[PDB]
Design a binder for this molecule. Structure first.
Ligand code: ILE
Length: 240
């Protein structure tokens, strides 16, 4: 009867959303991965040669400057070198920054959560890794990514007009979202009454007057972090 057909329709939809979540998660994994690779390659080059002349020429290579807003080296002694140039706030110390600390704590590649950029003052995410030469940490290489760029990547398609995608941490922190007002809120703040759980399937919740279906897919291949690709789908539209 109705209930079994209700379930048949629901499972069909969940199957479709699962597919979508999978290949969308892979897409963002692979996009982020190319950037992680540049940072890794850059740090490994610097481990062998970090003279001021090499640092300058390296950070100026177009494969970096056309990929990141800024690419930079923060050294163990606090010295900072960045391309391209920017006005910089007084007091700046790269060793105090989230990207530096996250990279050293991970002992290798990392992605920060959004943090307030020192110069542009906007939220950004950074790919970073320590520069290690024979066990000696010389400093950390970082490359900055705009949140705007990331929302574009995971929202390449509009899911038949059913909804959109966002990024969220395992602890429920919204990292990247089409709605700037939702960024760095938690799932619990956005959904105080009936909070979607990250494990391990599908949830309904109410947003802006409408029932949405939320589904979370792990993003693999992100070193040191546990992030999910979330689909947020208008429920009534989806079943139509
Ligand atoms: C100017 C920005 C620097 C390079 C980095 N994104 C930071 O805020 O620490």
């Amino acid at each position: 009867n109705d209930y079994l057909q209700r379930n048949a329709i629901r499972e069909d939809l969940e199957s479709y959303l699962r597919e979508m979540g999978d290949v969308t998660s892979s897409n963002i994994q692979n996009w982020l991965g190319g950037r992680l690779l540049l940072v890794e390659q850059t740090a490994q080059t610097l481990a062998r040669d970090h003279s001021p002349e090499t640092v300058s020429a390296l950070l100026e290579q177009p494969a970096l400057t056309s990929t990141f807003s800024f690419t930079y080296l923060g050294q163990q002694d606090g010295v900072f070198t960045m391309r391209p140039d920017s006005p910089m706030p007084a007091g700046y110390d790269p060793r105090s920054r989230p990207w530096y600390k996250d990279a050293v704590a991970a002992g290798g590649l990392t992605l920060t959560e959004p943090y307030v950029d020192a110069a542009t003052q906007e939220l950004i995410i950074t790919a970073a890794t320590p520069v290690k030469a024979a066990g000696n940490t010389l400093g950390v290489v970082g490359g900055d990514l705009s949140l705007k760029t990331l929302v574009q990547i995971i929202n390449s398609l509009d899911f038949s007009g059913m909804g959109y995608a966002f990024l969220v941490s395992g602890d429920g922190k919204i990292l990247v979202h089409p709605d700037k007002e939702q960024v760095m809120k938690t799932l619990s703040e956005v959904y105080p009454q009936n909070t979607p759980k990250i494990a391990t399937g599908f949830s309904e919740a109410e947003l802006h007057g409408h029932t949405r279906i939320l589904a979370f897919t792990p993003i693999k291949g992100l070193p040191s972090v546990t992030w999910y690709l979330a689909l947020s789908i208008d429920k009534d539209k989806a079943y139509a």
